[PDB]
Unconditional design. Structure first.
Length: 87
């Protein structure tokens, strides 16, 4: 049962956060090229890599992430694109 799709089999981070927030599991990241902004600052301390699931917070202007107790809000990785399967 392999799903082609040709554009990420799992749901989207902007289509599954818009409505009722749920725990989304990350299996791979996306969007990089050459970004040396704050994106690589708050995520440094927050050891949040592909594998664990977390509840997203679609805010009017930004997108925060809830991980047990700590929260990280930045671009790329945990914001737009990126694959997210499982519950």
């Amino acid at each position: 049962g392999s799903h082609m799709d040709a554009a990420a089999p799992g749901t989207r981070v902007i289509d599954a956060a818009t409505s009722m927030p749920r725990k989304v599991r990350i299996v791979q990241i996306n969007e990089i090229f050459q970004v040396e902004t704050d994106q690589f600052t708050q995520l440094l301390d927050a050891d949040i890599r592909v594998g664990s699931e977390v509840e997203i917070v679609d805010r009017d202007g930004h997108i925060t992430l809830s991980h047990n107790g700590k929260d990280v809000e930045l671009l790329d990785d945990l914001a737009h694109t990126i694959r997210i399967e499982e519950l």
